[PDB]
Design a protein around this ligand. Sequence first.
Ligand SMILES: NC(=O)c1ccc[n+]([C@@H]2O[C@H](COP(=O)([O-])OP(=O)(O)OC[C@H]3O[C@@H](n4cnc5c(N)ncnc54)[C@H](O)[C@@H]3O)[C@@H](O)[C@H]2O)c1
Ligand SMILES: NC(=O)c1ccc[n+]([C@@H]2O[C@H](COP(=O)([O-])OP(=O)(O)OC[C@H]3O[C@@H](n4cnc5c(N)ncnc54)[C@H](O)[C@@H]3O)[C@@H](O)[C@H]2O)c1
Ligand SMILES: N=C(N)NCCCCN
Ligand SMILES: N=C(N)NCCCCN
Lengths: 474, 474
Amino acid sequence: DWPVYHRIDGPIVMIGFGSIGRGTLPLIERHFAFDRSKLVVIDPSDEARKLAEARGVRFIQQAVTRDNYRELLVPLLTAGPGQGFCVNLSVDTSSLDIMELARENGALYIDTVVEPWLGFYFDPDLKPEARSNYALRETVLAARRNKPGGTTAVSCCGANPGMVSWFVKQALVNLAADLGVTGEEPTTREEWARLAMDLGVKGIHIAERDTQRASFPKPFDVFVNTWSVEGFVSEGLQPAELGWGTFERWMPDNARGHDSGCGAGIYLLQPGANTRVRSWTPTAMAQYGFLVTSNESISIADFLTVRDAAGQAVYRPTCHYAYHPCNDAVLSLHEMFGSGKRQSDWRILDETEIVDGIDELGVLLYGHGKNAYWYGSQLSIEETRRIAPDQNATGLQVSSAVLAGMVWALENPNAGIVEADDLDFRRCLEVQTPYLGPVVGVYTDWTPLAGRPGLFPEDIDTSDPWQFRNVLVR
Amino acid sequence: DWPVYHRIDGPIVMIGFGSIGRGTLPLIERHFAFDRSKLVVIDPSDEARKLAEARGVRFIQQAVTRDNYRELLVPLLTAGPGQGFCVNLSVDTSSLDIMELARENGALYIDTVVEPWLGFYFDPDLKPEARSNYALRETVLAARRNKPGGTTAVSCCGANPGMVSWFVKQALVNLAADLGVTGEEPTTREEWARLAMDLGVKGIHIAERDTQRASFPKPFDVFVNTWSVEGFVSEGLQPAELGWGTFERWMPDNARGHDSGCGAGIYLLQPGANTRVRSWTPTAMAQYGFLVTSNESISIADFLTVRDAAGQAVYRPTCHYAYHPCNDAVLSLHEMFGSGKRQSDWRILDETEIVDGIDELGVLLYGHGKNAYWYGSQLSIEETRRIAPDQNATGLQVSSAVLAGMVWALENPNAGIVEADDLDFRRCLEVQTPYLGPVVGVYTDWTPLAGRPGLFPEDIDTSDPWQFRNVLVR
Ligand SMILES: NC(=O)c1ccc[n+]([C@@H]2O[C@H](COP(=O)([O-])OP(=O)(O)OC[C@H]3O[C@@H](n4cnc5c(N)ncnc54)[C@H](O)[C@@H]3O)[C@@H](O)[C@H]2O)c1
Ligand SMILES: NC(=O)c1ccc[n+]([C@@H]2O[C@H](COP(=O)([O-])OP(=O)(O)OC[C@H]3O[C@@H](n4cnc5c(N)ncnc54)[C@H](O)[C@@H]3O)[C@@H](O)[C@H]2O)c1
Ligand SMILES: N=C(N)NCCCCN
Ligand SMILES: N=C(N)NCCCCN
């Protein structure tokens, strides 16, 4: 039977009951021991309420806001008798503020994104830099510097960001082993960064192809996706953003850096979901991905940075998302950007509405001696239905990563604010792997210069195929 | 009863029996009197052979090539009694060479495209300019100069190019009445151009939205379209191309012109089917179109050119395609350009495989006192099935235009080499309109600057919304 990993000796407050909350609830019920009445879900949606009622769980129909979050969450999280867990799977709420509240009150915390309070992105006074995930992540890093240690709070532990950080570590270990380099895995950040450097990893794509197909044709003026439409659209309209590698010799005119922080990132003055990059996955082969911002684009690049004695970064990989979402989402983006406005309506594909497909999600490490190596999950919708209810393949990759992060936090409850790169990757993947379907590593000789130059002149760097100059669709 | 317009007393030689041939042959049988045994269909494919045999129509299973076209076609064209008609609906054949052969032998000719002999576009020696439809059109214009008058040959008489030239004329007439511009209806090229000038038409999009949806989900590694995949892909990989208006104040760095010829065109050093433009149709509202080259982009701009005494152009409209193909074609393009190569397979949607949708195809005239005006056809697949067999809505707009061109050529058989702009638009529309479904004019206040500037800085021209600088997606 399914492993029960830990007892939760206090309230479980789930904030948000959308596609991820719905997929995560049954895993929490499955894998943790707790009096069922300890769990309560908070979401303003009527649709969410009706589903919660059907699932028999306590439900509070309320939006968490800057104005009410303390009066609402403090009593719920401290109801006792022991340590509670705030599982934040919402939109429109401040990850940082909720995380800091949980910590102040001794509750564990996890989320899958650094989200700001509602209103954040449509303020007519926020410059593009302030919209970036770099900036948002810096608020979390600052919180950690201000209050080191204390109760564990796991930031950005979904599929991506989240799981993909563990994939990068496993991929680095495999690359070394495949070269016949034996010896202990790295144990410190510095050792991981040096392993990437020593293997000659120039960069990393979070290389995803979602092939889930709907049972109905795409409706006009409806945005369709396999996870949050609101969240995807919001992220898609943020600047394109990437961790910026030391090997890069060119950036677009509209690229910008940051005055402060870890130094690992740049962003482009254009929306990520309307920015294409040339990339590759095992099922897609060569494909376009969208250069949508993601926390791990920065966090992984930062994590794998090697500095000289003077503190200057001398090695860092490029890192960014190369996302090919489901066909209906591709059409939805073309519709949205073509119209200049959000569709009037949206829907998230339910497992009952998906005829077939997988969410192929992995990390593509490139520039090393074997050119490119993709490592990740090929979870199908059919396998998903066999192993976890109320979600599609996209959702299960996320919900199972939340499960893994929750197990890690319960096992390591005094670790302070941590990112996915800080967790024990082997333990997290041991928890998650039952929900990931095939997890495979595949080498390819494909590069962004395959078939180039073609019929027209192009500004390419033929000496270094994986330069962003060659990857970016221009 | 359907009108039988004329008797055709000689051979009817149909070159190519793909999607358009299959839709055109029944209209030919319906609307012309002739002995059925005088029709001959030539196509290399077994698929076509079986379809022609099912119709009891004479079939020759050959590819027409530069090597064989004279020995193959001359006996067919001249079999008598009296004047034959060459109906060229093929790919991979030289429109100019076959046209010249037909003329030399006194046969009428019609096609829907200026196509080169197979091998043309894979010539790695070929400079981009030589790939352009402007160049191909110039070979036809030079043929007309070399041999003025003589037997009628109608070049590029499909839906677009073809029918849309007639829509431009009607739209100009409608604009003149709605704007209160007095004067007799034009009856010469010079008068038409002067009317466009007087109305202040800055430019024209061939503004198309195909909403035909398939009964099956898009297959991986299959290019799906509603008409020729080979043709669309070929055109899609040609340079983006447009008739270039005198009002334009900016062109991109990768734009180029021509050293000779009519002067009406530019092209961009990038593939047209991977070039997006901001455009509009009544059903789509604001949308992206692809800037795919088309003969009429040049022919309409040229036709509507006003010159001073020196022969310098003082007015000319911008004119180009802004094509939003069916959803499966949009996905197919993303797949093809993302992979850097043609899919392994392709299919053209049969009417039996289309669940719903329309081919909304018109002309969007902009820059005048009522901003923008769209005029064209909203033909649905349902209406298509009721009125014509063996084709979808895309096919019927094309096949009915070929019918109109054939009627016109029979009534005007010594007009020499002509384009759709040279034909009597009222007579052609009188023949075609029964097959076009709703034909409507719609004004809109939309402009390419709607919603702009937005979240990010953009290199726009705020002085004049319709500038190509604002239309082109960068
Ligand atoms: N790291 C990853 O891999 C990953 C993957 C998917 C989603 N996410 C993120 O997880 C979150 C949930 O995604 P989803 O697919 O479930 O989204 P969703 O849009 O399906 O659901 C979001 C839910 O939040 C609720 N909500 C809105 N305002 C709220 C408020 N003020 N307080 C409480 N709840 C509120 C909505 O009613 C909705 O049910 C999103 O922020 C998304 O960006 C991360
Ligand atoms: N102006 C317009 O509106 C318009 C619209 C659609 C198509 N077209 C053009 O019309 C033509 C026909 O389109 P379609 O949808 O029927 O294309 P299709 O791809 O369905 O059919 C093309 C046919 O040509 C045949 N063919 C190939 N090589 C040949 C050769 N050497 N000699 C004779 N036949 C040969 C093929 O076997 C096939 O049956 C294409 O060139 C296309 O570009 C124009
Ligand atoms: N990483 C993002 N920008 N969004 C969340 C993506 C989740 C789909 N695997
Ligand atoms: N005009 C072209 N480039 N191709 C022909 C398109 C026919 C779709 N109405």
